[PDB]
Short mmCIF file of C-alpha atoms and ligand atoms in Angstrom, two decimals:
data_model
loop_
_atom_site.label_atom_id
_atom_site.label_comp_id
_atom_site.label_asym_id
_atom_site.label_seq_id
_atom_site.Cartn_x
_atom_site.Cartn_y
_atom_site.Cartn_z
CA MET A 79 -14.88 -23.27 84.99
CA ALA A 80 -11.14 -23.50 84.21
CA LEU A 81 -11.56 -26.19 81.53
CA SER A 82 -14.07 -24.10 79.60
CA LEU A 83 -11.77 -21.08 79.03
CA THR A 84 -10.65 -20.39 75.37
CA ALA A 85 -6.82 -20.08 74.66
CA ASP A 86 -7.36 -16.28 74.62
CA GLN A 87 -9.37 -16.23 77.93
CA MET A 88 -6.71 -18.51 79.45
CA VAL A 89 -3.94 -15.89 78.53
CA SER A 90 -6.07 -13.01 79.75
CA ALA A 91 -6.68 -14.79 83.19
CA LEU A 92 -2.90 -15.69 83.60
CA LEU A 93 -1.81 -12.08 82.61
CA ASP A 94 -4.35 -10.60 85.10
CA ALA A 95 -3.17 -12.95 87.88
CA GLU A 96 0.38 -11.71 87.65
CA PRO A 97 2.06 -10.61 90.90
CA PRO A 98 3.48 -7.06 91.31
CA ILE A 99 7.17 -6.22 91.04
CA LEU A 100 8.35 -5.62 94.62
CA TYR A 101 11.25 -3.48 95.80
CA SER A 102 14.07 -4.58 98.08
CA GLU A 103 14.47 -3.00 101.47
CA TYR A 104 15.49 0.76 100.96
CA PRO A 105 27.68 -1.12 98.81
CA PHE A 106 26.81 -4.60 100.19
CA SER A 107 28.38 -7.40 102.31
CA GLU A 108 27.71 -11.12 102.04
CA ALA A 109 25.55 -10.81 105.21
CA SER A 110 23.53 -7.70 103.99
CA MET A 111 22.97 -9.19 100.42
CA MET A 112 21.74 -12.54 101.88
CA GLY A 113 19.35 -10.60 104.25
CA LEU A 114 17.96 -8.48 101.40
CA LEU A 115 17.34 -11.59 99.28
CA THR A 116 15.68 -13.51 102.08
CA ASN A 117 13.44 -10.59 102.87
CA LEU A 118 12.48 -10.10 99.22
CA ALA A 119 11.70 -13.81 98.74
CA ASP A 120 9.47 -13.82 101.92
CA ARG A 121 7.41 -10.81 100.63
CA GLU A 122 7.22 -12.34 97.10
CA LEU A 123 5.80 -15.57 98.64
CA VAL A 124 2.76 -13.89 100.01
CA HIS A 125 2.00 -12.49 96.48
CA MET A 126 2.79 -15.95 95.00
CA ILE A 127 -0.01 -17.50 97.13
CA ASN A 128 -2.48 -14.82 95.71
CA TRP A 129 -1.27 -15.64 92.18
CA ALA A 130 -1.51 -19.40 92.66
CA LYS A 131 -5.13 -19.11 93.86
CA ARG A 132 -5.91 -17.24 90.53
CA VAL A 133 -4.27 -19.92 88.14
CA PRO A 134 -7.32 -21.61 86.54
CA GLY A 135 -8.08 -24.94 88.18
CA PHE A 136 -5.75 -24.51 91.30
CA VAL A 137 -8.61 -23.73 93.63
CA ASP A 138 -10.40 -26.86 92.37
CA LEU A 139 -7.81 -28.88 94.31
CA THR A 140 -7.98 -29.65 98.03
CA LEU A 141 -6.05 -27.48 100.47
CA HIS A 142 -3.52 -30.35 101.10
CA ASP A 143 -2.78 -30.69 97.29
CA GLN A 144 -2.56 -26.98 96.79
CA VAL A 145 0.14 -26.98 99.63
CA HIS A 146 2.07 -29.98 98.13
CA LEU A 147 2.22 -28.08 94.72
CA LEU A 148 3.51 -24.86 96.34
CA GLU A 149 5.97 -26.68 98.58
CA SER A 150 7.56 -28.35 95.49
CA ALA A 151 7.43 -25.31 93.14
CA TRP A 152 7.85 -22.09 95.17
CA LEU A 153 11.65 -21.63 94.49
CA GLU A 154 11.20 -22.64 90.71
CA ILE A 155 8.37 -20.04 90.63
CA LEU A 156 10.62 -17.27 92.08
CA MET A 157 13.54 -18.35 89.86
CA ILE A 158 11.47 -18.25 86.56
CA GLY A 159 10.09 -14.80 87.63
CA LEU A 160 13.72 -13.67 88.22
CA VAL A 161 15.15 -15.00 84.97
CA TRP A 162 12.20 -13.39 83.01
CA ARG A 163 12.63 -9.90 84.57
CA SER A 164 16.55 -10.20 84.12
CA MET A 165 16.25 -10.98 80.33
CA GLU A 166 17.05 -7.43 79.21
CA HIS A 167 20.00 -7.06 81.66
CA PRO A 168 22.86 -9.30 80.33
CA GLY A 169 25.23 -10.37 83.13
CA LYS A 170 22.84 -9.09 85.85
CA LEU A 171 19.96 -10.48 88.01
CA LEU A 172 17.15 -8.01 88.47
CA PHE A 173 15.91 -9.17 91.97
CA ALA A 174 14.07 -5.79 92.23
CA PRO A 175 14.21 -2.36 90.34
CA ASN A 176 16.51 -1.18 93.21
CA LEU A 177 18.42 -4.52 93.41
CA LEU A 178 20.24 -5.43 90.16
CA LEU A 179 23.14 -7.75 91.02
CA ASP A 180 26.06 -8.96 89.04
CA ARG A 181 28.02 -12.29 89.16
CA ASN A 182 30.76 -10.69 91.44
CA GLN A 183 28.10 -9.67 93.99
CA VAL A 184 28.57 -15.83 99.77
CA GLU A 185 29.81 -19.44 99.50
CA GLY A 186 27.67 -21.56 97.12
CA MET A 187 25.75 -18.57 95.73
CA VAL A 188 28.13 -18.08 92.73
CA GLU A 189 27.12 -21.40 91.07
CA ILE A 190 23.31 -20.56 91.52
CA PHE A 191 23.84 -16.99 90.10
CA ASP A 192 25.76 -18.30 87.06
CA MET A 193 22.93 -20.83 86.27
CA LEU A 194 20.25 -18.16 86.58
CA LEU A 195 22.25 -15.75 84.34
CA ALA A 196 22.65 -18.52 81.68
CA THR A 197 18.90 -19.27 81.88
CA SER A 198 18.03 -15.60 81.56
CA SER A 199 20.35 -15.30 78.52
CA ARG A 200 18.78 -18.48 76.90
CA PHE A 201 15.27 -16.98 77.28
CA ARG A 202 16.46 -13.63 75.89
CA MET A 203 18.01 -15.56 72.81
CA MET A 204 14.62 -17.33 72.32
CA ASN A 205 12.75 -13.95 72.56
CA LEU A 206 10.48 -15.35 75.33
CA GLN A 207 7.12 -13.44 75.23
CA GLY A 208 5.16 -12.31 78.34
CA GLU A 209 2.20 -14.57 77.34
CA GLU A 210 4.51 -17.61 77.01
CA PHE A 211 6.14 -16.79 80.36
CA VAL A 212 2.81 -16.84 82.32
CA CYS A 213 1.96 -20.20 80.70
CA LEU A 214 5.43 -21.66 81.72
CA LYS A 215 5.10 -20.31 85.29
CA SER A 216 1.65 -21.96 85.60
CA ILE A 217 3.03 -25.34 84.16
CA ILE A 218 5.75 -25.20 86.90
CA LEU A 219 3.09 -24.80 89.61
CA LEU A 220 0.94 -27.66 88.39
CA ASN A 221 3.76 -30.04 87.28
CA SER A 222 6.60 -29.83 89.93
CA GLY A 223 4.79 -31.71 92.67
CA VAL A 224 2.33 -33.71 90.38
CA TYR A 225 4.40 -36.96 90.35
CA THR A 226 5.17 -36.82 94.12
CA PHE A 227 1.59 -36.87 95.52
CA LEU A 228 1.32 -39.62 98.31
CA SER A 229 -1.70 -41.60 96.93
CA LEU A 230 -6.55 -40.37 91.03
CA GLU A 231 -9.45 -38.27 89.46
CA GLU A 232 -7.64 -35.21 90.93
CA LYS A 233 -4.28 -36.09 89.21
CA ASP A 234 -6.22 -36.50 85.93
CA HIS A 235 -7.73 -32.98 86.63
CA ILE A 236 -4.18 -31.40 86.93
CA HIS A 237 -3.13 -33.17 83.70
CA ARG A 238 -6.20 -31.87 81.88
CA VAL A 239 -5.17 -28.18 83.02
CA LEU A 240 -1.55 -28.94 81.84
CA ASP A 241 -2.94 -30.09 78.39
CA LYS A 242 -5.03 -26.81 78.26
CA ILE A 243 -1.87 -24.76 78.92
CA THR A 244 0.04 -26.64 76.15
CA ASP A 245 -2.85 -25.81 73.74
CA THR A 246 -2.60 -22.13 74.95
CA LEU A 247 1.14 -22.10 74.21
CA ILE A 248 0.54 -23.51 70.71
CA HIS A 249 -2.26 -20.97 70.05
CA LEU A 250 0.16 -18.15 71.03
CA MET A 251 2.87 -19.48 68.64
CA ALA A 252 0.30 -19.95 65.72
CA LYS A 253 -1.00 -16.35 66.33
CA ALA A 254 2.71 -15.17 66.27
CA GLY A 255 2.97 -16.72 62.73
CA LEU A 256 5.02 -19.85 63.43
CA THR A 257 4.65 -22.84 61.02
CA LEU A 258 3.31 -26.07 62.53
CA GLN A 259 6.87 -27.33 62.56
CA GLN A 260 8.26 -24.32 64.34
CA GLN A 261 5.41 -24.53 66.83
CA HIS A 262 6.44 -27.96 68.08
CA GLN A 263 10.23 -27.08 67.99
CA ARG A 264 9.61 -23.92 70.07
CA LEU A 265 7.24 -25.69 72.49
CA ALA A 266 10.02 -28.37 73.11
CA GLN A 267 12.75 -25.69 73.56
CA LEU A 268 10.64 -23.85 76.18
CA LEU A 269 9.71 -27.10 78.09
CA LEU A 270 13.35 -28.36 78.11
CA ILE A 271 14.31 -25.09 79.85
CA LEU A 272 11.92 -26.26 82.73
CA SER A 273 14.29 -29.12 83.47
CA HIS A 274 17.09 -26.49 83.98
CA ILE A 275 14.75 -24.45 86.33
CA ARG A 276 14.19 -27.76 88.28
CA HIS A 277 17.84 -28.25 88.58
CA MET A 278 18.54 -24.66 89.80
CA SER A 279 15.79 -25.07 92.38
CA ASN A 280 17.30 -28.40 93.64
CA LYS A 281 20.72 -26.65 94.00
CA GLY A 282 19.07 -23.70 95.77
CA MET A 283 17.18 -26.07 98.26
CA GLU A 284 20.57 -27.72 98.99
CA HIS A 285 22.06 -24.32 99.85
CA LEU A 286 19.09 -23.47 102.14
CA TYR A 287 19.28 -26.94 104.01
CA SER A 288 23.11 -26.39 104.55
CA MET A 289 22.45 -23.14 106.59
CA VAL A 290 12.87 -23.45 104.01
CA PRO A 291 8.98 -22.78 103.87
CA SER A 292 7.33 -25.47 105.93
CA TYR A 293 4.12 -27.22 104.83
CA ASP A 294 2.52 -25.56 107.89
CA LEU A 295 3.30 -22.00 106.85
CA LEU A 296 2.15 -22.69 103.29
CA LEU A 297 -1.18 -24.15 104.54
CA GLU A 298 -1.81 -21.17 106.91
CA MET A 299 -1.09 -18.67 104.09
CA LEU A 300 -3.33 -20.69 101.62
CA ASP A 301 -6.08 -21.00 104.28
CA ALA A 302 -5.89 -17.26 105.21
CA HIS A 303 -7.29 -16.65 101.59
CA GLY B 223 29.75 -42.78 54.03
CA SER B 224 28.74 -40.61 56.95
CA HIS B 225 25.28 -38.83 57.60
CA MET B 226 25.45 -35.41 59.14
CA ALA B 227 23.01 -35.24 62.09
CA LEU B 228 20.88 -32.40 60.66
CA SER B 229 20.43 -34.19 57.27
CA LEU B 230 18.76 -37.33 58.78
CA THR B 231 15.10 -38.03 57.96
CA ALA B 232 12.81 -38.94 60.95
CA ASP B 233 13.02 -42.63 59.88
CA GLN B 234 16.93 -42.46 59.71
CA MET B 235 17.02 -40.84 63.22
CA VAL B 236 14.72 -43.56 64.69
CA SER B 237 16.90 -46.25 62.98
CA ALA B 238 20.22 -44.74 64.22
CA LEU B 239 18.90 -44.41 67.75
CA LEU B 240 17.41 -47.94 67.90
CA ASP B 241 20.71 -49.35 66.49
CA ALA B 242 22.85 -47.39 69.11
CA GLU B 243 20.82 -49.03 72.03
CA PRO B 244 22.95 -50.59 74.77
CA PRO B 245 22.25 -54.18 75.75
CA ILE B 246 20.25 -55.23 78.83
CA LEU B 247 22.94 -56.34 81.45
CA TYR B 248 22.60 -58.81 84.24
CA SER B 249 23.39 -58.25 87.96
CA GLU B 250 26.71 -59.94 88.86
CA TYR B 251 25.81 -62.36 91.62
CA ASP B 252 25.87 -66.18 91.95
CA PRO B 253 22.27 -67.51 91.69
CA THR B 254 23.24 -70.57 93.75
CA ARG B 255 23.93 -68.32 96.83
CA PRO B 256 21.24 -66.93 99.27
CA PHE B 257 20.16 -63.26 98.54
CA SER B 258 21.02 -62.40 102.22
CA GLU B 259 24.74 -62.35 101.53
CA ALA B 260 24.55 -60.19 98.38
CA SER B 261 24.57 -56.42 99.45
CA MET B 262 21.90 -54.54 97.47
CA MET B 263 24.07 -51.36 97.30
CA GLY B 264 27.05 -53.32 96.03
CA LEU B 265 24.98 -55.03 93.21
CA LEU B 266 23.54 -51.58 92.14
CA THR B 267 26.98 -49.95 92.14
CA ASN B 268 28.49 -52.80 90.10
CA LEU B 269 25.56 -52.73 87.52
CA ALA B 270 25.86 -48.94 87.14
CA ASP B 271 29.62 -49.19 86.50
CA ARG B 272 29.14 -51.80 83.83
CA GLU B 273 26.20 -49.88 82.24
CA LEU B 274 28.40 -46.72 82.16
CA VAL B 275 30.95 -48.37 79.76
CA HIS B 276 28.04 -49.26 77.33
CA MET B 277 26.68 -45.73 77.82
CA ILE B 278 29.96 -44.22 76.43
CA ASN B 279 29.58 -46.40 73.29
CA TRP B 280 25.87 -45.37 73.03
CA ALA B 281 26.66 -41.58 73.43
CA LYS B 282 29.30 -41.64 70.68
CA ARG B 283 26.54 -43.04 68.31
CA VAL B 284 23.85 -40.38 69.20
CA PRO B 285 23.64 -38.18 66.04
CA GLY B 286 25.49 -34.87 66.55
CA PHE B 287 27.36 -35.93 69.82
CA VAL B 288 30.69 -36.53 68.11
CA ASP B 289 30.40 -33.12 66.36
CA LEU B 290 31.23 -31.63 69.78
CA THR B 291 34.68 -31.11 71.28
CA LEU B 292 35.98 -33.88 73.79
CA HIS B 293 35.56 -31.17 76.54
CA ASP B 294 31.87 -30.62 75.65
CA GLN B 295 31.08 -34.31 75.31
CA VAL B 296 32.42 -34.92 78.81
CA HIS B 297 30.33 -31.96 80.27
CA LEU B 298 27.10 -33.50 78.73
CA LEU B 299 27.92 -37.00 80.16
CA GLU B 300 28.99 -35.72 83.53
CA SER B 301 25.64 -33.89 83.90
CA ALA B 302 23.36 -36.61 82.37
CA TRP B 303 24.77 -40.08 83.19
CA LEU B 304 22.38 -40.63 86.17
CA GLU B 305 19.26 -39.42 84.29
CA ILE B 306 20.35 -41.78 81.35
CA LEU B 307 20.52 -44.76 83.76
CA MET B 308 17.28 -43.73 85.40
CA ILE B 309 15.26 -43.29 82.15
CA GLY B 310 16.54 -46.84 81.09
CA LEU B 311 15.41 -48.27 84.38
CA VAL B 312 11.92 -46.66 84.34
CA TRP B 313 11.47 -47.88 80.70
CA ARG B 314 12.32 -51.47 81.45
CA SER B 315 10.27 -51.42 84.73
CA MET B 316 7.02 -50.30 82.93
CA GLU B 317 5.50 -53.85 82.81
CA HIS B 318 6.38 -54.50 86.52
CA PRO B 319 4.01 -52.30 88.75
CA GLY B 320 5.58 -51.67 92.11
CA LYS B 321 8.99 -53.11 91.06
CA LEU B 322 12.11 -51.79 89.51
CA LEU B 323 13.74 -54.07 86.93
CA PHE B 324 17.37 -53.21 87.46
CA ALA B 325 18.28 -56.32 85.56
CA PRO B 326 16.38 -59.58 84.48
CA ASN B 327 17.87 -61.25 87.63
CA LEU B 328 17.35 -58.09 89.80
CA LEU B 329 13.69 -57.05 90.26
CA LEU B 330 13.38 -54.98 93.42
CA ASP B 331 10.33 -53.82 95.34
CA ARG B 332 9.86 -50.75 97.59
CA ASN B 333 10.48 -52.81 100.78
CA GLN B 334 13.98 -53.80 99.37
CA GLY B 335 14.71 -50.10 98.90
CA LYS B 336 13.84 -49.53 102.68
CA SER B 337 16.99 -51.54 103.64
CA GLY B 338 17.75 -42.34 101.45
CA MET B 339 17.10 -44.96 98.68
CA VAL B 340 13.36 -45.34 99.46
CA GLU B 341 12.51 -41.72 98.38
CA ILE B 342 14.43 -42.32 95.06
CA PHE B 343 12.82 -45.79 94.48
CA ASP B 344 9.36 -44.26 95.02
CA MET B 345 10.00 -41.49 92.51
CA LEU B 346 11.36 -44.03 89.85
CA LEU B 347 8.22 -46.18 90.48
CA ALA B 348 5.91 -43.16 89.91
CA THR B 349 7.81 -42.27 86.66
CA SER B 350 7.62 -45.90 85.41
CA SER B 351 3.90 -45.99 86.17
CA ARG B 352 3.29 -42.68 84.32
CA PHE B 353 5.24 -44.01 81.22
CA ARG B 354 3.12 -47.26 81.41
CA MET B 355 -0.22 -45.21 81.55
CA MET B 356 1.09 -43.14 78.48
CA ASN B 357 1.97 -46.32 76.66
CA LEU B 358 5.51 -45.00 75.96
CA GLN B 359 6.92 -46.60 72.79
CA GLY B 360 10.47 -47.98 72.28
CA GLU B 361 10.98 -45.43 69.41
CA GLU B 362 9.87 -42.50 71.66
CA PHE B 363 12.07 -43.76 74.51
CA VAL B 364 15.27 -43.62 72.43
CA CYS B 365 14.34 -40.12 71.36
CA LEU B 366 13.84 -39.05 75.04
CA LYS B 367 17.13 -40.66 76.16
CA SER B 368 19.02 -38.71 73.40
CA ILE B 369 17.23 -35.43 74.47
CA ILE B 370 18.49 -35.93 78.04
CA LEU B 371 22.04 -36.35 76.90
CA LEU B 372 21.98 -33.21 74.71
CA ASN B 373 19.87 -30.99 77.08
CA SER B 374 21.81 -32.01 80.32
CA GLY B 375 23.07 -29.61 83.01
CA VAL B 376 22.58 -25.91 83.20
CA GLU B 377 27.88 -21.44 67.07
CA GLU B 378 28.29 -24.74 68.91
CA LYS B 379 25.22 -23.86 70.99
CA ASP B 380 23.02 -23.60 67.88
CA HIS B 381 24.16 -27.07 66.63
CA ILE B 382 22.97 -28.70 69.89
CA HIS B 383 19.65 -26.64 69.61
CA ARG B 384 19.22 -27.79 66.03
CA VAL B 385 20.00 -31.54 66.80
CA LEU B 386 17.43 -31.23 69.65
CA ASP B 387 14.97 -29.72 67.06
CA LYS B 388 15.62 -32.77 64.84
CA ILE B 389 14.80 -35.16 67.68
CA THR B 390 11.54 -33.23 68.41
CA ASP B 391 10.68 -33.56 64.70
CA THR B 392 11.37 -37.31 65.02
CA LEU B 393 9.03 -37.54 68.04
CA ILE B 394 6.27 -35.72 66.24
CA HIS B 395 6.73 -37.98 63.07
CA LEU B 396 6.41 -41.06 65.31
CA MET B 397 3.24 -39.60 66.91
CA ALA B 398 1.64 -38.51 63.55
CA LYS B 399 2.38 -42.11 62.17
CA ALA B 400 0.69 -43.57 65.33
CA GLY B 401 -2.37 -41.60 64.29
CA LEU B 402 -2.46 -38.67 66.75
CA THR B 403 -4.05 -35.42 65.59
CA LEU B 404 -1.71 -32.30 65.52
CA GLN B 405 -3.25 -31.21 68.93
CA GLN B 406 -2.74 -34.57 70.50
CA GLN B 407 0.85 -34.65 69.11
CA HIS B 408 1.60 -31.33 71.04
CA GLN B 409 -0.06 -32.51 74.22
CA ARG B 410 1.85 -35.87 74.19
CA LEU B 411 5.18 -34.12 73.35
CA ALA B 412 4.58 -31.76 76.37
CA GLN B 413 3.62 -34.58 78.71
CA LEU B 414 6.87 -36.49 77.86
CA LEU B 415 9.11 -33.28 78.14
CA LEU B 416 7.54 -32.53 81.55
CA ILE B 417 8.46 -36.02 82.77
CA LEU B 418 12.04 -35.12 81.81
CA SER B 419 12.00 -32.36 84.49
CA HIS B 420 10.98 -35.13 87.07
CA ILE B 421 13.81 -37.32 85.75
CA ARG B 422 16.20 -34.29 86.33
CA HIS B 423 14.75 -33.97 89.85
CA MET B 424 15.33 -37.73 90.64
CA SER B 425 18.92 -37.40 89.28
CA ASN B 426 19.61 -34.35 91.53
CA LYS B 427 18.29 -36.28 94.54
CA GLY B 428 20.39 -39.30 93.38
CA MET B 429 23.57 -37.14 93.05
CA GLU B 430 22.84 -35.66 96.62
CA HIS B 431 22.74 -39.25 97.95
CA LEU B 432 26.12 -40.23 96.20
CA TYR B 433 27.82 -36.96 97.47
CA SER B 434 26.59 -37.69 101.07
CA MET B 435 28.37 -41.15 101.19
CA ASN B 436 35.06 -42.04 94.59
CA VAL B 437 31.40 -42.88 94.16
CA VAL B 438 30.51 -40.09 91.65
CA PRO B 439 32.16 -40.21 88.11
CA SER B 440 34.60 -37.34 88.09
CA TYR B 441 35.05 -34.98 85.01
CA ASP B 442 38.56 -36.76 84.69
CA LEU B 443 37.27 -40.39 84.68
CA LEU B 444 34.61 -39.54 82.08
CA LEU B 445 37.23 -37.67 79.91
CA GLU B 446 39.37 -40.80 80.24
CA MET B 447 36.42 -43.11 79.33
CA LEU B 448 35.48 -41.08 76.15
CA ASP B 449 39.16 -40.82 75.12
CA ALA B 450 39.75 -44.60 75.73
CA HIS B 451 36.80 -45.42 73.37
CA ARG B 452 39.15 -44.29 70.45
CA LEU B 453 41.23 -47.45 71.23
CA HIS B 454 38.30 -49.98 71.18
CA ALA B 455 37.74 -52.49 68.31
CA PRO B 456 35.48 -51.18 65.52
C1 LIG C 282 19.47 -15.90 100.04
O1 LIG C 282 18.64 -15.94 98.85
C2 LIG C 282 17.38 -16.57 99.02
C3 LIG C 282 16.89 -16.95 100.22
C4 LIG C 282 15.68 -17.56 100.33
N1 LIG C 282 15.16 -18.00 101.54
C5 LIG C 282 13.93 -17.57 102.16
C6 LIG C 282 12.58 -18.16 101.62
N2 LIG C 282 12.48 -19.03 102.87
C7 LIG C 282 11.14 -18.98 103.46
C8 LIG C 282 11.21 -19.00 105.01
C9 LIG C 282 9.82 -18.71 105.66
F1 LIG C 282 8.80 -19.27 104.91
C10 LIG C 282 13.50 -18.14 103.47
C11 LIG C 282 14.92 -17.79 99.17
C12 LIG C 282 15.45 -17.36 97.96
C13 LIG C 282 16.67 -16.73 97.87
C14 LIG C 282 17.26 -16.31 96.51
C15 LIG C 282 16.15 -15.53 95.85
C16 LIG C 282 15.55 -14.38 96.55
C17 LIG C 282 14.62 -13.63 95.91
C18 LIG C 282 14.18 -13.94 94.66
N3 LIG C 282 13.27 -13.39 93.83
N4 LIG C 282 13.18 -14.00 92.65
C19 LIG C 282 14.08 -14.98 92.65
C20 LIG C 282 14.74 -14.98 93.84
C21 LIG C 282 15.68 -15.74 94.44
C22 LIG C 282 16.35 -16.92 93.76
C23 LIG C 282 17.73 -17.27 94.22
C24 LIG C 282 18.80 -16.36 93.77
N5 LIG C 282 17.75 -17.35 95.71
C25 LIG C 282 17.32 -18.72 96.28
C26 LIG C 282 18.30 -19.86 96.47
F2 LIG C 282 18.54 -20.60 95.27
C27 LIG C 282 19.30 -19.85 97.45
C28 LIG C 282 18.10 -20.66 97.66
C1 LIG C 283 23.69 -47.75 94.80
O1 LIG C 283 23.01 -47.38 93.57
C2 LIG C 283 23.69 -46.69 92.67
C3 LIG C 283 25.10 -46.44 92.78
C4 LIG C 283 25.73 -45.75 91.79
N1 LIG C 283 27.14 -45.47 91.93
C5 LIG C 283 28.08 -45.99 90.99
C6 LIG C 283 28.32 -45.29 89.68
N2 LIG C 283 29.54 -44.74 90.26
C7 LIG C 283 30.77 -44.77 89.35
C8 LIG C 283 32.04 -44.60 90.07
C9 LIG C 283 33.01 -43.67 89.34
F1 LIG C 283 32.70 -43.63 88.00
C10 LIG C 283 29.60 -45.72 91.36
C11 LIG C 283 25.08 -45.37 90.69
C12 LIG C 283 23.74 -45.61 90.53
C13 LIG C 283 23.00 -46.29 91.53
C14 LIG C 283 21.54 -46.56 91.34
C15 LIG C 283 21.35 -47.27 89.99
C16 LIG C 283 22.15 -48.33 89.70
C17 LIG C 283 22.08 -48.98 88.44
C18 LIG C 283 21.01 -48.53 87.55
N3 LIG C 283 20.70 -48.91 86.34
N4 LIG C 283 19.66 -48.26 85.76
C19 LIG C 283 19.39 -47.38 86.75
C20 LIG C 283 20.18 -47.43 87.85
C21 LIG C 283 20.35 -46.78 89.15
C22 LIG C 283 19.47 -45.64 89.44
C23 LIG C 283 19.38 -45.39 90.97
C24 LIG C 283 18.56 -46.36 91.76
N5 LIG C 283 20.77 -45.35 91.45
C25 LIG C 283 20.86 -44.69 92.80
C26 LIG C 283 21.30 -43.29 92.89
F2 LIG C 283 20.35 -42.39 92.38
C27 LIG C 283 22.08 -42.73 94.06
C28 LIG C 283 22.76 -42.90 92.75
#
């Protein structure tokens, strides 16, 4: 079914799969801010599983492969969502409508906050569209753990979906009135930002390991369907 | 005369990048001595240090890089040096399934990596295998290596963006001349750029390994290397 969707049907399915914007628990300390962020991330993860299951082609994968992809991508997925919703707030990170944090607001957190702010500002300068954002978030889910699977026809399937999402991005750009040349330049600029999201996630994982959703929780959440 | 980076045709970009290529270096060990007395970590460290000197010369020849201030050139090299070494390795290991061709006299398998290095070797092998399956071309490789240098880490900003746009145009030109349809051109471009996020990942895991053990090039050493280049013979 996934591979038969037109570029317009792909966009519609991705937009419809979008998770809701959650609120933080109703001045802060390092301890209170860290607690609020941890709590928010845990609640967003449950919605992220529902979203992942609705990304065309994701449920065609085995439970083990779905878990591997989520284990590799969950923090990148949270981070891209954050940078998207913080676009219209220069110098601030919109974690939630009731949790808009500046750079000044924990050891090791400042470098991560600065990188997220710079990423949000880069997407704002590129005028990233909602339809492009859902494509990029789906690419992160299918790509981040693709080159790290232990053991062939299934890997080809993920790549086919990734090619379908690229086609979808191009279609969006052609409908927005970009010339063929502008289309490949914009495609490249967006995909290069995914290397920075990977980087930020790696720095974030380092921070968490120095104080992490296990394969077991992810499997139970995916199985709970 | 001197070409400004943004004025280069796709053929002139390919030619400048191919001409800027560093040489393939050899590992520095006596072939008359048993491999048991060599130290794999020592050989890799020595090779990387020698490759880093050639990398400085290469970076200075990447169109648009010398248009940046010394401070900005250092920042880009500090963030990208390991990804640059890694992409070079995965390119030259393409024709050796299951092995990493560090040098013509240093072809290492997964078992030799078992002697935190095993996870990094496995990721490099998967990247090399993916580039082999995609039939990555020499001309595409030089473009990707230059993109890594300019896109590294996390108006002068517009210039980098425009030089990156020029390199993308160059990649597309190479793909169009190879006979790919506009759609196949976009798909191949996306597949190559998505591998770059995995190369970033491998470099982050590599840096973590180095920080866990003067083994990481400091901002100061790189600044000195770029500045010392001014004193080299032309
Ligand atoms: C202290 O901050 C965080 C803590 C966690 N740890 C939790 C998830 N883990 C799961 C355990 C049971 F499964 C425990 C996760 C994320 C964050 C926040 C966070 C929080 C909510 C976000 N929404 N959108 C983006 C969000 C982000 C992104 C960055 C700013 N950050 C992550 C990081 F880089 C430091 C590791
Ligand atoms: C022990 O292995 C390495 C050691 C170093 N440290 C050195 C550079 N530093 C400079 C001192 C001050 F400037 C000391 C650098 C690289 C490597 C090798 C290495 C080596 C030569 C390579 N050529 N092409 C790719 C190469 C690679 C890629 C991976 C396998 N890497 C391992 C890694 F990720 C942990 C760092």
